[PDB]
Amino acid sequence: AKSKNHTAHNQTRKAHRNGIKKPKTYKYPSLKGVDPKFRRNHKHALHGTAKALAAAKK
Amino acid sequence: ARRPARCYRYQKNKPYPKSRYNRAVPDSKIRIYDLGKKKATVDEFPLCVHLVSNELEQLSSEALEAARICANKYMTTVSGRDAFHLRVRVHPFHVLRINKMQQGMRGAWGKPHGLAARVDIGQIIFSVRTKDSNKDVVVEGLRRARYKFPGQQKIILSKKWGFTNLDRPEYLKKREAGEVKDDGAFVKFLSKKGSLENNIREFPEYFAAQA
């Protein structure tokens, strides 16, 4: 008993009921997968200027 | 055991040439495509009449061949073997397949069965060149060949000089000038482009612009 094999029929109908949701956007995206040498330093860089800005409200 | 032409008249498939990929394919039943006085010069045979397809279809190699024999046969015995030049203008490069015949429709890929030329609307099938004074004789050749072919084709008098690419005067103007020079059965034209030097070598009878 052979039967149908494959079809994309109707599939974009379904895809469009509830979206094709756009891709969602953020200020400050994740540093995920960023060069560890950078990220290591960058941290200390940030820690510093933080300390500096507490130093502005002494 | 040949199937009726009917089974392959239309261009249902994509071109299936003989190839590395195909290979085991029979010979094309039609093997000569230029007959009559083909050695003849361009000047010899001014008039040119065509057999012209009015259909998008497929002509067998076998019907190509049969036709070829029909027209050449007529044209010679009525006007001689040196009267005319018949050019089959169509080569059967597309292989037709066959599902010859434990199994049934499981895995059904044909084996080569025969050849066919695939032909457009307006596409020339045969071409003939002669002396004007033979027109009737030629046209009767192509008319009889017609009976050998599926689909409607129609015979059309050319405006051109033989198998040349020029209508009758423009060839004349070019010839009674200097620009033309005889070749095997075709001809060569003087170009205004290229090395002046060996352009002057060839075509001596130009470069006065008169006789």
Binding site: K22 | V52, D167
Partner: protein, 159 residues
């Protein structure tokens, strides 16, 4: 059986451009990339390492990383009814800066100008783009140009 390997179906796509094989010219490597830069993606078949997969060919993305011999580009691939974020480690031979924003930047730098150059005169600006408007009235003359009158032509064969 079917075949669906990484570079499958890519015969012409990673092919090399007529009369353009061989070393890649050095400007490809002198070019510089910063995070936030928008690049276009195009595989250089001569460079097998660091290659984008075919799907990302002809795609534009944003750099999110800069490493020794590569940039990390992030593309939105839409799988299903939705986009997911994909991150591409491409070598620099497969990336170029997009001009997709050059007209914007040219537009802005220039919009700053005629904005000041108007204000500091006496307002009246108008600096949103507008679509092609229908054309206006006009008067075409005959002087030197009387209408030539064409008809349709008979049928003829030439062959």
């Amino acid at each position: 059986g079917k075949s669906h390997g990484y570079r499958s179906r890519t015969r012409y796509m990673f092919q090399r451009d007529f009369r353009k094989h061989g070393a890649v010219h050095l400007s490809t490597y002198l070019k510089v990339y910063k995070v936030g830069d928008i690049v276009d993606i195009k595989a250089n078949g001569s460079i097998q390492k660091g290659m984008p997969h075919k799907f990302y060919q002809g795609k534009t993305g944003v750099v999110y990383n800069v490493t020794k011999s590569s940039v990390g580009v992030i593309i939105n691939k839409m799988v299903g009814n939705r986009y997911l974020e994909k991150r591409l480690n491409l070598r620099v031979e497969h990336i170029k800066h997009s001009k997709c924003r050059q007209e914007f930047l040219e537009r802005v730098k220039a919009n700053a100008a005629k904005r000041a150059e108007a204000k500091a005169q006496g307002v009246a600006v108008q600096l949103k783009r507008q679509p092609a408007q229908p054309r206006e009235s006009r008067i075409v003359s005959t002087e030197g140009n009387v209408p030539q009158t064409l008809a349709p032509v008979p049928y003829e064969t030439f062959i």
